[PDB]
């Protein structure tokens, strides 16, 4: 088979996640993203039913890639002596929610609402498939700027969803809940709902609410921009210091602020086109 059925293009980015490149599938000019993960930097390993020892991201993406969904799909993967190479779907034109907020600042509530709903729909899909992302943030959300469809990326800090406590967090500290900071213990859904509150505030305020551990432990949110009282209410609910006091994905989606959402194409025509 060999790994030269893809044509390598510009390096999209690099970090602890490895290196991501823009690619093209030679067989049908399909756009793809190629991620190279060094074997040494793999924290949590997984195993495929056939016995192959692989990165956990491959396990979790195979559980959620039975599309369609708001999750970037794993098309293929390869093993090399000192690395693993993942072939993922690449929307085009595409923009990162982090870069989108860097350019446009605080998003209008109608846009934040459409974007936030699609994340909820995507996260619910991962949970329905027994996968937990565990690093929900603007940097891990791509926008298909023509279709106005958002898609989740980077399951490298994810895990299989479980009803017991997690005592491992390899995600963004400023997006981590107070219970992780204090006890180094959290539960999947409530820790996902905290991060969703950090995300919605980031959308509507143009920045995360907390920079340091004390601000997190305190969990008191100051609104720097004009934001509706219903939106502030949902944010503060998602950011309840006690996990049990946070909403469920159903309660978030049934909140008065989450009503009369736009469809992806309407959002792109009103807010993204031109
Ligand atoms: N969060 C960054 C946004 C801009 C490009 C580099 C990104 N860093 C990462 C980190 C880990 N992963 N894991 C998968 C991706 C990924 C997947 C598909 C992509 C499609 C188009 C553009 C970037 C893409 C990034 C990724 N990007």
């Amino acid at each position: 088979p060999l790994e030269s059925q893809y044509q390598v293009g510009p390096l999209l980015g690099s970090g602890g996640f490895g290196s991501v490149y823009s690619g093209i599938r030679v067989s049908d000019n399909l756009p793809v993203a190629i991620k190279h993960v060094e074997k040494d930097r793999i924290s949590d390993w997984g195993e495929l039913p056939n016995g192959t020892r692989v990165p956990m991201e491959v396990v979790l993406l195979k559980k959620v890639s039975s599309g369609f969904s708001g999750v970037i799909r794993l098309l293929d993967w390869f093993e090399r002596p000192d690395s693993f190479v993942l072939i993922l779907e690449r929307p085009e034109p595409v923009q990162d929610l982090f870069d989108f907020i860097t350019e446009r600042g605080a998003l209008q509530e109608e846009l934040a609402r459409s974007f936030f709903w699609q994340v909820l729909e995507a996260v619910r899909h991962c949970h329905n498939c027994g996968v937990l992302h565990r690093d929900i943030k603007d940097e891990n959300i791509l926008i298909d700027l023509n279709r106005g469809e958002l898609k989740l990326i980077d399951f490298g800090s994810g895990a299989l969803l479980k009803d017991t406590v997690y005592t491992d967090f390899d995600g963004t500290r400023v997006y981590s809940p107070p219970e992780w900071i204090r006890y180094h213990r959290y539960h999947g859904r409530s820790a996902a709902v905290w991060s969703l509150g950090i995300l919605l505030y980031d959308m509507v305020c143009g920045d995360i609410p907390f920079e340091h551990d004390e601000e997190i432990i305190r969990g008191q949110v100051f609104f720097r921009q004009r934001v509706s009282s219903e939106c502030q209410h949902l944010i503060r609910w998602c950011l309840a210091l006690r996990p049990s006091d946070r909403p469920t994905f159903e309660e978030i989606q049934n909140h008065p602020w989450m009503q009369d959402v736009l469809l992806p194409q309407e959002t792109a025509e009103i807010h993204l086109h031109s």
Side-chain angles (χ1 to χ4, degrees):
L2 216 129
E3 207 241 283
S4 294
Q5 26 180 130
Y6 301 96
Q7 192 210 238
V8 188
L11 180 77
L12 294 171
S14 80
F17 57 84
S19 286
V20 185
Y21 294 88
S22 166
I24 266 152
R25 193 164 60 196
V26 161
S27 76
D28 64 353
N29 305 305
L30 180 79
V32 293
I34 307 168
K35 197 166 94 165
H36 296 259
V37 197
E38 254 168 4
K39 282 174 165 167
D40 305 313
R41 296 222 71 76
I42 310 190
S43 46
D44 204 335
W45 289 78
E47 168 165 310
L48 294 174
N50 76 323
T52 337
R53 203 209 187 186
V54 299
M56 195 67 213
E57 181 163 23
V58 174
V59 169
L60 305 176
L61 283 164
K62 288 185 101 71
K63 291 175 63 51
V64 310
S65 283
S66 47
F68 307 119
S69 57
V71 189
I72 282 296
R73 290 173 75 169
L74 180 65
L75 308 186
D76 200 11
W77 65 280
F78 301 86
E79 184 178 3
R80 281 173 158 179
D82 315 303
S83 79
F84 276 92
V85 182
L86 311 189
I87 309 302
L88 301 142
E89 96 191 320
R90 176 161 63 85
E92 200 55 31
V94 66
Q95 196 184 21
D96 184 23
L97 188 54
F98 181 101
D99 295 340
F100 187 90
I101 294 162
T102 298
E103 295 189 349
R104 301 177 49 156
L107 311 191
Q108 292 175 36
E109 283 175 43
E110 179 177 74
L111 190 51
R113 179 176 310 107
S114 178
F115 279 13
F116 192 61
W117 179 271
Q118 297 196 51
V119 170
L120 267 281
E121 285 292 320
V123 169
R124 283 180 62 199
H125 167 84
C126 300
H127 285 55
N128 189 38
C129 293
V131 172
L132 198 68
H133 191 284
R134 310 203 289 182
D135 197 27
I136 293 154
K137 48 171 179 182
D138 53 355
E139 298 176 79
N140 282 330
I141 289 160
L142 309 174
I143 313 163
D144 177 333
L145 294 163
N146 279 352
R147 300 189 181 282
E149 305 173 348
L150 269 55
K151 262 153 161 60
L152 266 46
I153 50 151
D154 195 28
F155 289 85
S157 301
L160 295 163
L161 186 77
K162 100 242 245 266
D163 294 302
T164 52
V165 77
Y166 288 92
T167 63
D168 66 277
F169 186 72
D170 226 304
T172 315
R173 202 163 174 84
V174 286
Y175 270 90
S176 80
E179 67 271 6
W180 168 255
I181 298 303
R182 291 174 66 164
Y183 317 115
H184 292 260
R185 285 174 75 82
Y186 67 94
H187 282 88
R189 302 154 197 78
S190 18
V193 169
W194 173 271
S195 74
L196 289 163
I198 299 297
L199 180 60
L200 180 50
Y201 182 96
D202 183 51
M203 283 190 296
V204 296
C205 296
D207 243 300
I208 59 169
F210 313 130
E211 20 287 336
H212 307 97
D213 295 0
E214 302 73 24
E215 296 173 319
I216 300 173
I217 291 158
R218 188 155 182 258
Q220 201 161 329
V221 286
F222 165 81
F223 283 87
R224 57 191 87 192
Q225 303 247 1
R226 205 291 158 169
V227 172
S228 73
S229 272
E230 302 197 313
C231 182
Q232 290 190 10
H233 176 265
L234 182 46
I235 286 164
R236 286 183 167 120
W237 198 4
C238 289
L239 300 179
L241 291 171
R242 282 171 57 208
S244 49
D245 290 332
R246 293 173 198 151
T248 57
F249 306 130
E250 176 170 15
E251 289 178 307
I252 289 167
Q253 291 186 296
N254 286 323
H255 188 280
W257 190 72
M258 289 281 265
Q259 297 315 306
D260 308 296
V261 72
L262 290 186
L263 300 167
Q265 200 63 64
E266 292 193 84
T267 314
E269 288 165 1
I270 298 166
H271 300 281
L272 312 173
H273 291 173
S274 203

